[model samples]
Target: SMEQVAMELRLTELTRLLRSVLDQLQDKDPARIFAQPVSLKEVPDYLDHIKHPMDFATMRKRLEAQGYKNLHEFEEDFDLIIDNCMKYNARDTVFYRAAVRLRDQGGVVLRQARREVDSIG
Candidate 1:
């Protein structure tokens, strides 16, 4: 019972830390294009190009549902959002640039998260 309680507390702390990371990334998106799913109607070929689409809204839903078991899992989806943007949009485009910027800022926040995790442990 004690171990179980400890596990629950660890999970809660992880969830809270991950939510903070997600918030930081969402705020870093200057264009705010990654806030939601890409509209299929607007980008007809997006799915064809990017097999896996990720967005802040989807990440938020997943976080709320406790879908991530660890920090690595959360990082995967966070990276996906930027990767998908870079993959779908050309280098010259604004979307691509925004993704690049977000990627840079995200790296900082994720490293900070790792430090916090380590400190707590």
Candidate 2:
């Protein structure tokens, strides 16, 4: 029961963190934005489409070991997952586009977050 609750909390936290990071980057690089323009209200639907259960399962475990208390911590796993999809999910156009958005947004946040610190450490 506790483990399930932990997983659920982690899911919610990570999901919110992901959405927040994406929103933070929504206008950062307009020239290299989502292939299909997304409205602020459409974010949840967009995120819902990209969240792969298998990917979530794996990342949840990774996040457990790798603390996501900060944006930099979360970005590590985010980049890994998005990069993997870009490299492997190419045939799946939906996933490919989503991965592109994830990658670009994650990059924007990582850079922005790093500006707050001396580095992303």
Candidate 3:
């Protein structure tokens, strides 16, 4: 059913929004992200090794700091994005992705902003 675009659009967008928030690491623990398929439990432990970025350069820095030694490592793995997204996205992915993206981005961006303020103060 992976090829089915209708139902998958909502799911994938939800997942991408989830990943976008995840990179921010705002109050979320990765376990909360995949409520099922919980066996992928080690994901966060691995992720914890990578620092969250308050902004874009820091995000790139986190990638470089990893000694992954390849600049392209800075690229986001869209697996999580595609897994939750549909095979052929119609308009269905929009409204849901927009809402989820906004709410999640707000939470995490505000979190990053607060941390920035704290560091300055």
Per-candidate RMSD, Å: 1.3, 10.4, 18.4
Candidate-wise lDDT, in order: 0.89, 0.54, 0.38
Candidate 3 Cα errors over 4 Å, as ranges: 1-4, 26-121
- The TM-scores of all predictions, comma-separated, are 0.92, 0.40, 0.21
- Score candidate 2 by lDDT: 0.54
Given candidate 2, what's the lDDT at residue 42? Answer: 50
Where model 1 places Cα greater than 4 Å from the true spot, the runs are none
- Candidate with best TM-score: 1
Model 3 worst lDDT run, 10 consecutive residues: 31-40
CA shift at 54, candidate 1, in angstroms? 0.2
Residue 107, model 3: Cα distance from true site in angstroms: 5.3
Model 1: per-residue lDDT, tens digit, 3-98? 999988888888898898888889898678899899999888888898999999999999987788888899899889989988888999999999
| Model 2 pairs whose backbones collide | none
lDDT by residue for model 3 (1-121), tens: 6667844654444344434543564233232332222122644453343333122333434443442222123224222322232222234765235334534544556465445434643
When sorted by lDDT, best at the front, the candidate numbers are 1, 2, 3
Off by over 4 Å in 2: 1-73, 119-121
Q: Identify the leading candidate in terms of lDDT.
A: 1
